[PDB]
Design a protein around this ligand. Structure first.
Ligand code: A1JBZ
Ligand code: A1JBZ
Ligand code: FBP
Ligand code: FBP
Ligand code: FBP
Ligand code: FBP
Ligand code: OXL
Ligand code: OXL
Ligand code: OXL
Ligand code: OXL
Ligand code: K
Ligand code: K
Ligand code: K
Ligand code: K
Ligand code: MG
Ligand code: MG
Ligand code: MG
Ligand code: MG
Lengths: 423, 427, 436, 425
């Protein structure tokens, strides 16, 4: 029964053609949904009660579109999101962190960072946003300007550069090099370049981000018809599935959740499609290619990450449990696209929110009492991941897990991988 | 010899990549497609696309197959649609640069939950034979016996009509292998399939069926809601263009338009959009792995047509042949070349008007109907048809003097004897 | 180039010119051959063990010391010739030469002692002389038995029974010497610890032009099973009388290593020849060159694709450690082992990094010479009060010995493989350590 | 039939990985195909007898090597005459006649910087006596090849120059040497003295790989069956060396003292023949063809384009043979570079080209003696039928087999462009 579920016959195929031939509509997905859902907050999704339904449906990142609404409007949206998120904090083994992303208005006709963007970025730092989706990034200096406007207090905010025009596509490599990740902003991109070429830019950018090990978001009109209709079109479900098969870390909803009549249903639909698409991923070729393309490294976190993903595939590990302060150890595991869920146990609430940008990372916020012996504290965070995993359905007694830790406290010292039997 | 400009176009840097990941990384929005569009466009005929003048615009935009939906309209209504299509097609018989064969496909109403073929389908199928349709899109095919019933309804005079089985429910998906074995091809009928099975599972059924059809070397059509928003809007959504591109990258031989052309406000624009996306997607196909996998998966064969076809596709890739010119009576030799997905266009020269229309079901086949009177000496009749294919190729933009072409012929007249592959320099 | 650019900038272009590294990074086997370079010097320690047959030319304690320094890892006693008294003296001389270096772990070299049986002769089962010789082996503490003319699984069970309860730890390497042994190979390998491709008798039992097929098939199946395989007989035959081998002989040694053999053997070359030490030096020189020429990219990928999924944590840790070692060009994989099994499971994935196996078992230290790339270190310190400190001291012992022996340098990365509790069977930890 | 797929290591050939291919190698799987690696036998006191040479041709000798390091011009002229007499004794039966090449192996430069004066005299002797190939000793650079070419003069333009790589400089300057040479000999005797003995296998494997990539013949030479000079059976290292030279990709294997001065010249040839057939069946064509295909550059030459199409077609149907018409041997050489499992039966009217194509693995030359037919299409058909009739007589073909037929569109060399699939009747 285990080998009939999650497209395992198609996963064992020796060629991609045979993999497609073995895809089965009766093979049910078992693993947790890896691709994060970004939902744009607006009139249709602003209430605390509606936001609780969206968190339960699968929303991982709340997007604030600063093209519309005042600072007072967005502060209320943030407070409502935080209230809905913290309503589930009473059960720590099942609490789901939710990131808050600020999407900038953009430069418009201006040459650099607009004055409104400087004010909105400052607002973001003051309100503790986790991510910035920087509109119309055309070159590396645009990213440096966004970074500078965040100041010394916004050092930890992730900058996701939105590629929306020909210049952004042509200067992609220099933009990705200085950014934390990319958003394929298909709405403007589809007007700036011929509509029939957007798929080439999406597939290229996702590929280059996967190669770089940096998050990539597929955005705009994924389930457009769901703004007025309860069910999407056949092109829309195919688009969501293909963004996941392309290698996107995140999928987004704009009008579908901000102003549409079915915001919760749009989130449920993206969740349902993503789980199906993630099981249909051809890991045999994907891992081989990612593994071959990733350069040789003398960084112990990078070295441990490859060893752990290889070990997870060898035993069909249910999960890779990793201790992370900044999210980096979980991100380095995520770049190899393991089938095993990457359960990231962290004390940082911000890192827990931000790792939703990395596919297959399931953040757990550690709020249990400290142990006096560092080694004892480490084993406690590990047993915590195992209890949250059992509660959420990721793990069962008898499963094997790969545990990734470091040799001393503080970020940057991950160097250990262990094979553990559950219970 | 070819120049650096040649190797910058049609995603050639991405095509030479050693891995699929590197292939994606090398895809370039500035790399323009050069080759002719190889995925056929099926357009549904209705009130928005019925007039002779509108049909001429649709043929110019790229329509290769006209679909008659027998779920609506009388026999008199469909006969008029057929006559209007034929009039619009024959209006280009003058200029060889613009003349193009257009297939006529009859889409059946269906069993509507009843045993065997419905009485209306028996009558509509008989209408199709009497009006000389080329293809039948058989609705709600659930098992092999459904195909045999459609085949028996094509009566004594319609055995040459191609049966494309529409897979629209769970049973059709589960019994796919037995259905494909007795069918000429398949249509992934996503509209009903999306209601019959969970909407989030349709992509698995589409990708599986396209894969199995590619492995079998039989045509597969991707259908329904590809550019749905274009029924009321002049431009499609980002999901819609992505869907068209992904159906081509999946391996579909044909893409379809339904309400977009039958009843919408922009039928010609919907055809133009599918044409534009398909050309872009066909250049982005990763032929290196696709050919290797089709080669490895295809069983060994002692059929000389199958053996010649793989030799010719290999020869075309080796020299970047501008085209593979094949002589075919039934379309079979062109279909066997098409199954290996050559980048080179397959120019199929035939005396059969029906085979010329039907080969639009096979990706990359460009049919040329040959009407010259036969030569007393057979080898001369063959050379005249090879030169007809070269001159139409030169006229249409495929070929130039100095290009290399692969020519596929047989050792004796009649169907079933293809066994020769020649490398020719265009003079 | 982009997959090695930062590491090339860090380690230098000279590092990537040595040990056939340009040929190792090739994307195809054809390109790998095209990039093989006679100027690319081997850097790694020799990983294929040399088995030298002991005889009149290699019996003195002084000669045996020169053979240990030349590279002999396993001493073979051919029980087809000589009395029990003769073999006991050979064993004592080997042990005396081996223990003459036991003053420091960075100079000590464990040497296994293998007993090669006379065989069944015309008989259907175990001979009475073999029963006596096998009991002699147990009484004299031999590490391995090379069982002659193994034709089926019951032959190996008979050898195992004749070793008795005290010889349970002795490794049985079945010699395949005829058509029946080749046809029943799978059942023989299943019950044996390893195989010897006994080419001398095999070349008489089957057509001489078919021996290479049997050698390549058996080596492949042993590599797939993760069990040791020895290539034997006439590898450097002409060196019995000549100081230099023929062009076919050096090619044979290189090709046995490229085929995947864990061990290579010398018979008359060391037992009776005029150049026993030179024959060992020649096999050492060829094996080092051939090991660097191995196409690890395809070999590792194929060992992973062929190896079935495993729920054994030792097996899971071993593949993770080998993957980590390739990622950083680790100088070594240091493993703690009681029976040698954790080191054997690392060895089956054919890492380029040396597997330094730290053990308290003197017998396991001798027996792991059967596994390609395993460098045994015998730990002699008494156990620490805290188990977690005892483990750490053993790892530091492997690092300090590795530094003093040239395997490791300051700045190198090493992969360390340990377990969660004492006793055999609990390896489950892999650590990436920087050498300071 | 099931029996067909049990022979010639077909289970091992269908394997998905090289490791599984090795695991499936079967000593009971008998080779069926004709031996495709040519055997070069060195002529000497043990192999000059016209009667002994007839036995060596029957055993499998394809190329007779004259070592100009020993013997006078008078001695070598007699060698040539004896070889030609033994070869032409079988000309009475054209369907089974085997052409045999004559190769002149030069003495070399010695302490000199360039072409020695003795080599100039020996080279002119070769042109005057109609040798087919020159094995040029101690080639260190491209100018050495140009000097050998110049010493052959205007009448020796058709002679093939195989450069012998015997030292470190030849290995370092390999690419420039191969570019101007027709092929290479891995001259292991001197190479094993010039560089460390333990490095020769790296130079052999590299050179064979580069020659295979270039589509040019490569010869593995020296001490392959050395012990057979005095013993009736070779050592285990010797049979392994022959098998591994074939698995490496060598087009030719050589015998020196084994046939020139030993006591078992015919048995040494029979042993190389037996080992080569076994090793050729054990070749992992799945990866080999894929890699040769991927590495070979795109081509606009119709002979090259036809050759790859014909090799692909031959693999698709398990063709027993690829029958090619060739004037210079080039069309057959271009088929050979893709290492088809199907025998390449080359029909030619050029006696020299028939002898020289023995340098290309898997090329079986047939000398066609009939004067041209008036109708060119009938002349082409008669040659193809001669290849079929020869192939049936020699065991290459049977009724029911499929064969790939490679021809051109007009007479003369350089116009091959047609591939056809033919059923044997
Ligand atoms: O060559 S294909 O286009 C073909 C399509 C139809 C066929 O029937 C077929 O045989 C051949 N094919 C396309 C799908 N992929 S895939 O395995 O799904 C895959 C998909 C995506 C990959 N990354 C790397 C690039 C960034 C995103 C993640 C991958 N990395 O490695 N493999 C990958 C195989 C290759
Ligand atoms: O990767 S390997 O070293 C390995 C893999 C797992 C093993 O278990 C093993 O022992 C070793 N391996 C070594 C043998 N070859 S091979 O298939 O015999 C072969 C042999 C030779 C090839 N050319 C290129 C060089 C000139 C001659 C033709 C070839 N081109 O493509 N394949 C080729 C596969 C690759
Ligand atoms: O992924 P990051 O940010 O580098 O954090 C990983 C760090 O977490 C740990 O596992 C635990 O460290 P702390 O006890 O400081 O939380 C470290 O050993 C390791 O360096
Ligand atoms: O693709 P099909 O239907 O088998 O037709 C291919 C046939 O066409 C030809 O090339 C030409 O035949 P005709 O002269 O009868 O048209 C035949 O030699 C070959 O058998
Ligand atoms: O390779 P083996 O034979 O399983 O031995 C590995 C064992 O060695 C250890 O690393 C150390 O164990 P000891 O304290 O008994 O020496 C164990 O944790 C592990 O189980
Ligand atoms: O391999 P080569 O030397 O190019 O010779 C091939 C030539 O042989 C032929 O097949 C037959 O030519 P001939 O009639 O002159 O022998 C030509 O059509 C072709 O050009
Ligand atoms: O800004 C965006 O999100 C877009 O343009 O798609
Ligand atoms: O009938 C159709 O075309 C469908 O259901 O999509
Ligand atoms: O016994 C042996 O070692 C042999 O026969 O090779
Ligand atoms: O010259 C040769 O043949 C050699 O040196 O091997
Ligand atoms: K915005
Ligand atoms: K219908
Ligand atoms: K013995
Ligand atoms: K010479
Ligand atoms: Mg925008
Ligand atoms: Mg329908
Ligand atoms: Mg023996
Ligand atoms: Mg020499």
């Amino acid at each position: 029964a285990f080998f009939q579920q999650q497209q395992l016959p198609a996963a064992m195929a020796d060629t991609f053609l045979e993999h497609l031939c073995l895809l089965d509509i009766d093979s049910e997905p078992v693993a947790a949904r890896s691709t994060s859902i970004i939902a744009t907050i607006g009139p249709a999704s602003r209430s605390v009660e509606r936001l609780k339904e969206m968190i339960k449906a699968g929303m991982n990142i709340a997007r604030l579109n600063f093209s519309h609404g005042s600072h007072e409007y967005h502060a209320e949206s943030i407070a409502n999101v935080r209230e809905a998120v913290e309503s589930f904090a009473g059960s720590p083994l099942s609490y789901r962190p939710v990131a808050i992303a600020l999407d900038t208005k953009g430069p418009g006709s201006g040459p650099g960072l607009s004055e409104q963007d400087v004010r909105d970025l400052r607002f973001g730092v003051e309100h503790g946003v986790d991510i910035v989706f920087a509109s119309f990034v055309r070159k590396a200096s645009d990213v440096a300007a966004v970074r500078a406007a965040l100041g010394p207090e916004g050092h930890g905010i992730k900058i996701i550069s939105k590629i929306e025009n020909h210049e952004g596509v042509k200067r992609f490599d220099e933009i990705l090099e200085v950014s934390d990740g990319i958003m394929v902003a298909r709405g403007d991109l589809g007007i700036e370049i011929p509509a029939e070429k957007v798929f080439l830019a999406q597939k290229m950018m996702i590929g280059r981000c996967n190669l770089a090990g940096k998050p990539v978001v597929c955005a705009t009109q994924m389930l457009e018809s769901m703004i007025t209709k309860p069910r999407p079109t056949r092109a829309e479900t195919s688009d969501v599935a293909n963004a996941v098969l392309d290698g996107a870390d995140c999928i987004m909803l704009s009008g579908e959740t901000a102003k549409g009549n079915f915001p919760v249903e749009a989130v449920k639909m993206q969740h349902a499609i993503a789980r199906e698409a993630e099981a249909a991923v051809y890991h045999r070729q994907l891992f081989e290619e990612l593994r071959r393309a990733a350069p040789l490294s003398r960084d112990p976190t990078e070295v441990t990450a490859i060893g752990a993903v290889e070990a997870a595939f060898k035993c069909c590990a249910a999960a890779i449990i990793v201790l992370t302060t900044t999210g980096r150890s979980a991100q380095l595991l995520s770049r190899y696209r393991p089938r095993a869920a990457v359960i990231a146990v962290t004390r940082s609430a911000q890192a827990a929110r931000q790792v939703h940008l990395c596919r297959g990372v399931f953040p757990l916020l550690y709020r249990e009492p400290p142990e006096a012996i560092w080694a004892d504290d480490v084993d406690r965070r590990v047993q915590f991941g195992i209890e949250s995993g059992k509660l959420r359905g990721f793990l069962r007694v008898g499963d094997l897990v790969i545990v990734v830790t470091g040799w001393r406290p503080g970020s940057g010292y991950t160097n250990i991988m262990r094979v553990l039997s559950i219970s």
